[PDB]
Amino acid sequence: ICLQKTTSTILKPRLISEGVCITDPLLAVDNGFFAYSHLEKIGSCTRGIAKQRIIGVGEVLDRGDKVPSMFMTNVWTPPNPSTIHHCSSTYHEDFYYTLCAVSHVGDPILNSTSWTESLSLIRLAVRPKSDYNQKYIAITKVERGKYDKVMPYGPSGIKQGDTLYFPAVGFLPRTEFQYNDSNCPIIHCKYSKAENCRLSMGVNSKSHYILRSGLLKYNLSLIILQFIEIADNRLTIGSPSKIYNSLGQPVFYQASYSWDTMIKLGDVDTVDPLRVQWRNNSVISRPGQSQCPRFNVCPEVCWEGTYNDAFLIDRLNWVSAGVYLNSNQTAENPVFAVFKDNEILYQVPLAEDDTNAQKTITDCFLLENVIWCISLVEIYDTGDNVIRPKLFAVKIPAQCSE
Amino acid sequence: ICLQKTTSTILKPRLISEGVCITDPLLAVDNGFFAYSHLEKIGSCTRGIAKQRIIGVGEVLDRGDKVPSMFMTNVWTPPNPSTIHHCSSTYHEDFYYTLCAVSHVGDPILNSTSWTESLSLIRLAVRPDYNQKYIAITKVERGKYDKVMPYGPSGIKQGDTLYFPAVGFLPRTEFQYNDSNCPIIHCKYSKAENCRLSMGVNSKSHYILRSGLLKYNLSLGGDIILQFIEIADNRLTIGSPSKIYNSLGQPVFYQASYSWDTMIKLGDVDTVDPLRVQWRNNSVISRPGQSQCPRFNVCPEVCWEGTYNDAFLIDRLNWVSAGVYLNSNQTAENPVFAVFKDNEILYQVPLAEDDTNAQKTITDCFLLENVIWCISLVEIYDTGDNVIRPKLFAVKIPAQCSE
Ligand SMILES: *[C@@H]1O[C@H](CO)[C@@H](O[C@@H]2O[C@H](CO)[C@@H](O)[C@H](O)[C@H]2NC(C)=O)[C@H](O)[C@H]1NC(C)=O
Ligand SMILES: *[C@@H]1O[C@H](CO)[C@@H](O)[C@H](O)[C@H]1NC(C)=O
Ligand SMILES: *[C@@H]1O[C@H](CO)[C@@H](O)[C@H](O)[C@H]1NC(C)=O
Ligand SMILES: *[C@@H]1O[C@H](CO)[C@@H](O)[C@H](O)[C@H]1NC(C)=O
Ligand SMILES: *[C@@H]1O[C@H](CO)[C@@H](O)[C@H](O)[C@H]1NC(C)=O
């Protein structure tokens, strides 16, 4: 692995795959296998009617070209696509377990007061055999502490033994939320007031719940899910997030849907309860809107941002890789970057300038002992009004050659 | 490759993956890629209405287990599955092209008087209009023949010229046959004219069937054309589902034995225009049959009956070939993978239990990591259930004749 800053486009991404939009996408990659999901909506990606959800699993293989390829092996379609939301998948023992939420009022985040917190599970098999292939589970027993209702809320989690750990969130009513507004860091911020951080824990300032991210534990040995909650350090609103394991040490990514826009990732120290030692990263941020744009550090009352995760290639030098959007206040300019917290080593755009691309999921691995990365980017066609997930594969160079 | 007869099951097959039946299956395998097709019928496989027809291509790959696997990459469903019939596929330059017949009166073979000849082509890209192109073929040159049609699972390429297995429907009023050539030398009960009446479906069928090729040339890309090629008189047998394929750089032909000549019909093609095959005088491998033409029959009788059970030439110098055959004189059952010679079965392995019923078998072989592997589509039945499902067995051909 190259560890040297250069402006050379040594990276070469290779794309590897009527009136509708393909949205709410999922990507997990583990030990040769992968899981993906999306929602086919007819019309507006934010408000369109649902056409069909799919969840699939498959294998990650190379051909003679020693380039990874997606090969779907197992696919499930729910008989109603209007009801499945916020799927998260973790891989254990030749099976991929996709934990979804069920709703009759739409997205549990936006009509959150009204949602009876129904969960479920879909286990699909990475290699099908002619219920091994496909099992559904209506989860009924959930342990969530003070939280009024919990929910998975991220693309992928991890296994530890027979215990899965999905990225999840808890909706704690803000009457019971414990926060000293003295801790809200407005020391250098002329504009910031004290209570923003607390009002920044929900969708509205007058949202009824706050959101706190964490994990959902599922111990296969024993079936019951246990909500775990994220540590106070660097506390921001419950957001789509992802736990994954690199080099045998687990790492957490939280998307930055509120004022703290610099990227939130770092090694998890403990998993019960969830403590992450966040990186002091000063180069990778997120595109916001008018109120909380890229690189903002001052506590304001906003909910806005896009999930653009990254993945840790080298621990000792902490080199990491992800697709980020190089736009302040807009979803334009997708870019694949390999970076260090105070420095960006090298990059390559993945589109043209006005290209709009809202979300990016990124998992990396060894293909024949070469470090490759698969990135899902929610790119739009130039005419637009359609979001189509596009999968780029990118080899991480070992030399810093020409 | 082993070349020593043994009763040892050194062969080890590995299966490699609402109210319906999966019938009329297709398999082609070429240079790492594969084509498959089937018809999903609701109910009786013979008389059932059809739900879906899938024409797919994909890649044949191994994982860490060094075993081949199917990986679908491109799939097409026609908007009406009641109208598509007898597809055959050939692979050229990153495109797999499948040639189908179109009918509004059902299977052209069984209602040939009422069938207008309509032909269509589907090209699928094996690594995705590049992905999927349809063509309604309008220009066909068929010589004396009243109507032609593809009739087999796969054919071969030569340059930009594809060669699909096909059949021609020549009305028997224009068929020229000296019944003196009908070989009844040793055959007590066998009359002279059977061979002639044996060239159709009925004795009183209005057409006969003659197998051959359809030639499509890419080089002359303008417009659409298709030229029927008939087959050499030697070992003439009714036009039947057949397959041309290339092994070791020489093309080989397999014709199914749907009439009295029940011993297997295969061998190297000498020429391609017009179609001459030097058939093997093969004495160990025959085809299950109904009462009139039981397996191992060699006497000319008036029958039309048999199952397509092809073989593949693993080794030309010793003519070692591999195929699945049905071990049943008068029933379709007892599917058994065999590797065999002209006058000797070398070694075998059953692929199911004794009553297991398996109507059809397609067999293509290749090198996976420089080892001789074979894929066999076997159209088997799920135990008690009537419905048929195609099952794909992968079988490694041993080089040593070990334990
Ligand atoms: C397929 O079509 C081409 C037509 O271009 C045939 O070969 C060419 O024929 C044209 C004249 O029709 C010549 O200009 C070229 O020199 C020919 N190229 C050759 C012979 O290589 C081609 O032979 C046809 N294939 C078959 C099997 O008939
Ligand atoms: C899962 O349950 C078994 C059953 O007693 C237990 O031994 C194991 O520790 C559990 N896994 C955990 C708690 O992570
Ligand atoms: C985005 O915001 C930061 C901080 O306010 C600023 O440095 C940067 O220049 C802004 N974007 C552009 C395009 O100038
Ligand atoms: C043959 O075609 C005729 C006339 O179109 C039709 O009535 C009959 O059902 C067909 N026979 C079949 C499909 O066996
Ligand atoms: C099938 O027929 C041949 C010769 O007509 C005979 O040798 C063979 O034994 C028959 N099969 C059975 C099961 O008897």
Side-chain angles (χ1 to χ4, degrees), chain A residues 1-128 131-402, chain B residues 1-222 224-403:
Chain A
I1 187 168
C2 175
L3 306 172
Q4 194 64 23
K5 173 163 183 39
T6 176
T7 54
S8 303
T9 65
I10 60 172
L11 299 156
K12 310 194 162 46
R14 189 177 293 173
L15 194 65
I16 52 175
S17 72
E18 174 265 313
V20 288
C21 178
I22 304 288
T23 188
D24 195 356
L26 188 154
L27 183 72
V29 176
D30 282 284
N31 314 316
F33 314 80
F34 76 85
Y36 158 53
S37 185
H38 68 274
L39 180 59
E40 200 170 319
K41 285 177 169 268
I42 305 175
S44 68
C45 309
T46 63
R47 299 174 167 181
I49 303 305
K51 158 148 181 44
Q52 70 170 258
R53 165 79 63 181
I54 67 168
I55 306 161
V57 311
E59 297 190 58
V60 175
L61 317 178
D62 49 358
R63 286 80 55 86
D65 60 358
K66 303 190 175 182
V67 164
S69 294
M70 60 83 73
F71 297 106
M72 272 286 171
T73 64
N74 195 6
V75 160
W76 181 75
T77 305
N80 190 298
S82 298
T83 68
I84 289 282
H85 286 98
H86 297 307
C87 298
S88 195
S89 71
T90 289
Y91 168 62
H92 177 237
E93 273 182 358
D94 289 61
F95 264 115
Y96 245 120
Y97 308 73
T98 189
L99 163 69
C100 298
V102 185
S103 166
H104 273 175
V105 289
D107 186 2
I109 301 288
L110 307 180
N111 193 357
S112 188
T113 197
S114 300
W115 176 56
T116 64
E117 67 94 19
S118 174
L119 291 180
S120 57
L121 198 148
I122 309 91
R123 60 185 289 272
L124 298 187
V126 287
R127 160 78 171 179
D131 292 330
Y132 181 57
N133 293 355
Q134 300 191 351
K135 194 201 161 33
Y136 196 82
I137 292 151
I139 296 169
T140 58
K141 289 194 156 203
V142 166
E143 288 166 0
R144 47 214 201 283
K146 38 200 177 177
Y147 295 90
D148 193 308
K149 41 191 73 158
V150 292
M151 186 200 76
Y153 188 70
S156 61
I158 58 172
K159 52 153 204 184
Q160 288 197 338
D162 268 16
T163 307
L164 311 187
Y165 287 102
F166 299 77
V169 73
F171 302 190
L172 181 147
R174 50 177 77 215
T175 65
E176 303 298 294
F177 182 38
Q178 279 293 74
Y179 205 52
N180 201 353
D181 290 288
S182 302
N183 303 354
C184 186
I186 64 186
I187 307 169
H188 292 299
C189 292
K190 179 207 65 50
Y191 275 116
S192 298
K193 301 176 48 184
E195 71 269 5
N196 294 114
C197 300
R198 185 171 53 64
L199 303 151
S200 177
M201 281 297 179
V203 172
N204 319 106
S205 50
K206 288 167 281 182
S207 82
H208 177 74
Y209 294 104
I210 67 167
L211 307 183
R212 176 71 150 290
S213 68
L215 301 157
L216 280 169
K217 180 180 178 182
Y218 190 63
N219 179 16
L220 301 158
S221 308
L222 310 191
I223 309 314
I224 297 191
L225 288 162
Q226 321 179 7
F227 183 66
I228 313 302
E229 111 182 359
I230 199 168
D232 45 2
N233 175 1
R234 283 196 64 128
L235 46 98
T236 67
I237 193 166
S239 67
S241 57
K242 180 173 77 177
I243 178 172
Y244 64 102
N245 208 308
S246 300
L247 310 196
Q249 158 89 1
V251 189
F252 196 93
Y253 166 85
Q254 183 162 14
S256 316
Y257 281 85
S258 76
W259 58 263
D260 192 340
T261 67
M262 299 306 312
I263 200 58
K264 289 196 82 185
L265 77 165
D267 285 353
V268 299
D269 300 308
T270 79
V271 178
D272 264 3
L274 180 49
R275 284 202 75 77
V276 192
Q277 50 171 53
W278 307 106
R279 306 308 285 178
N280 298 323
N281 184 301
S282 62
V283 302
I284 297 309
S285 190
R286 49 144 199 120
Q289 302 176 14
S290 65
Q291 178 72 15
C292 283
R294 267 181 85 192
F295 301 117
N296 174 70
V297 189
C298 276
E300 313 279 336
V301 169
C302 62
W303 186 57
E304 63 204 8
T306 61
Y307 177 108
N308 298 106
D309 65 354
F311 201 106
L312 164 64
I313 51 195
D314 172 359
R315 186 154 292 120
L316 313 182
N317 320 121
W318 201 259
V319 191
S320 313
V323 167
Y324 80 91
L325 297 178
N326 193 2
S327 181
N328 289 28
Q329 287 198 357
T330 299
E332 63 185 342
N333 297 4
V335 181
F336 188 82
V338 168
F339 59 109
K340 218 160 315 161
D341 329 303
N342 289 356
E343 162 177 58
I344 298 183
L345 309 176
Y346 39 89
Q347 292 180 139
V348 58
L350 291 155
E352 294 154 297
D353 288 333
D354 76 335
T355 57
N356 319 299
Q358 308 204 1
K359 183 167 179 172
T360 71
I361 309 181
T362 305
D363 290 312
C364 304
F365 52 83
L366 280 180
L367 185 76
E368 296 180 359
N369 192 246
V370 190
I371 313 99
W372 277 92
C373 288
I374 302 318
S375 297
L376 182 57
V377 170
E378 223 176 357
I379 276 163
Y380 280 63
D381 298 301
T382 67
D384 295 302
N385 199 1
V386 43
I387 327 180
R388 166 57 203 180
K390 283 204 158 193
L391 291 172
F392 300 79
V394 166
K395 177 141 47 81
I396 303 309
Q399 310 192 323
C400 312
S401 192
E402 75 284 7
Chain B
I1 187 168
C2 177
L3 299 179
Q4 192 70 13
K5 172 169 189 38
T6 178
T7 182
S8 305
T9 65
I10 60 189
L11 295 159
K12 294 181 285 293
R14 173 180 279 81
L15 192 65
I16 50 170
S17 73
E18 178 264 311
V20 290
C21 180
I22 304 288
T23 188
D24 194 354
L26 186 153
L27 185 68
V29 175
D30 279 284
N31 310 316
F33 314 78
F34 77 84
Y36 158 53
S37 187
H38 68 275
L39 176 59
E40 199 172 313
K41 285 178 166 268
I42 307 169
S44 56
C45 313
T46 57
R47 280 204 176 122
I49 320 94
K51 181 173 169 189
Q52 177 167 0
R53 155 71 77 177
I54 84 95
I55 303 177
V57 312
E59 301 194 49
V60 176
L61 315 181
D62 51 358
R63 287 82 55 84
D65 58 357
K66 305 195 158 196
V67 165
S69 294
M70 69 161 202
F71 296 103
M72 274 286 186
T73 64
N74 198 3
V75 158
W76 181 76
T77 305
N80 192 297
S82 297
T83 68
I84 294 282
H85 286 100
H86 301 306
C87 301
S88 195
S89 83
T90 300
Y91 164 62
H92 175 239
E93 287 183 3
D94 294 63
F95 259 124
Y96 236 120
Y97 311 71
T98 199
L99 162 71
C100 300
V102 185
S103 167
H104 285 145
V105 289
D107 182 10
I109 300 285
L110 306 179
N111 196 355
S112 181
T113 184
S114 320
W115 174 62
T116 69
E117 173 190 1
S118 182
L119 290 194
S120 65
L121 197 156
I122 309 91
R123 72 158 176 221
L124 304 172
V126 288
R127 197 139 77 224
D129 292 332
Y130 180 59
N131 296 351
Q132 305 189 349
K133 182 70 174 176
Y134 198 83
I135 286 152
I137 298 168
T138 55
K139 282 172 172 174
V140 169
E141 295 173 0
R142 48 216 203 263
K144 65 180 72 66
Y145 296 95
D146 197 310
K147 39 176 55 60
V148 292
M149 188 199 76
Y151 190 73
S154 61
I156 58 174
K157 68 183 180 175
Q158 286 163 180
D160 289 331
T161 309
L162 311 186
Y163 285 102
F164 300 77
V167 70
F169 302 187
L170 186 148
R172 68 181 72 195
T173 79
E174 308 295 295
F175 187 36
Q176 285 167 70
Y177 203 51
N178 197 350
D179 292 288
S180 302
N181 304 355
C182 185
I184 61 171
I185 309 148
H186 311 293
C187 280
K188 290 162 72 170
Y189 286 72
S190 306
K191 301 173 58 178
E193 72 261 31
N194 295 113
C195 301
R196 186 167 56 66
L197 303 150
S198 176
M199 279 304 164
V201 169
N202 315 300
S203 45
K204 304 173 62 153
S205 82
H206 183 72
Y207 294 97
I208 66 168
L209 308 183
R210 177 70 152 290
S211 278
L213 303 155
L214 281 167
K215 186 175 69 63
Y216 173 112
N217 186 1
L218 298 139
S219 293
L220 182 71
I224 201 54
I225 56 89
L226 260 192
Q227 323 181 25
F228 184 65
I229 305 301
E230 83 180 3
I231 201 177
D233 39 2
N234 324 95
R235 281 197 66 125
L236 192 53
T237 59
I238 190 168
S240 70
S242 57
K243 181 172 77 177
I244 178 174
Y245 66 89
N246 265 303
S247 308
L248 309 197
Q250 179 167 3
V252 181
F253 200 96
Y254 165 86
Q255 188 169 0
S257 296
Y258 281 85
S259 74
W260 59 262
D261 188 353
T262 68
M263 301 303 310
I264 192 176
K265 290 200 76 187
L266 75 166
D268 287 354
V269 300
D270 300 308
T271 77
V272 178
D273 264 6
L275 182 48
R276 174 67 188 271
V277 192
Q278 50 172 51
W279 307 104
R280 312 305 282 187
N281 301 329
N282 183 304
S283 60
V284 302
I285 301 309
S286 187
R287 55 105 175 120
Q290 306 187 2
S291 59
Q292 188 72 6
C293 285
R295 178 165 52 122
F296 302 120
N297 175 62
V298 190
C299 278
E301 314 279 338
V302 168
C303 62
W304 186 58
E305 63 202 5
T307 57
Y308 177 107
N309 298 107
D310 65 354
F312 201 105
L313 170 61
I314 294 169
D315 177 359
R316 191 157 298 122
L317 292 203
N318 313 113
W319 198 259
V320 161
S321 49
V324 167
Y325 83 94
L326 300 180
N327 187 353
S328 178
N329 283 37
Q330 297 185 3
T331 59
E333 55 173 60
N334 294 292
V336 170
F337 190 82
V339 192
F340 64 98
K341 281 208 291 185
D342 293 330
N343 279 1
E344 162 182 48
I345 296 163
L346 291 186
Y347 40 85
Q348 294 188 145
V349 59
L351 289 157
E353 304 148 310
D354 289 333
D355 76 336
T356 58
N357 315 292
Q359 306 271 357
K360 185 167 177 173
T361 75
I362 308 183
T363 304
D364 289 311
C365 304
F366 52 82
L367 279 184
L368 184 79
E369 294 187 358
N370 189 249
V371 188
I372 307 99
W373 275 92
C374 285
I375 300 319
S376 296
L377 181 58
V378 167
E379 216 188 356
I380 217 161
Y381 284 60
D382 175 7
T383 187
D385 306 2
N386 54 356
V387 295
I388 324 175
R389 175 69 214 193
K391 286 201 188 157
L392 275 152
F393 300 77
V395 164
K396 173 150 52 79
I397 303 307
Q400 185 180 5
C401 314
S402 187
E403 74 281 10

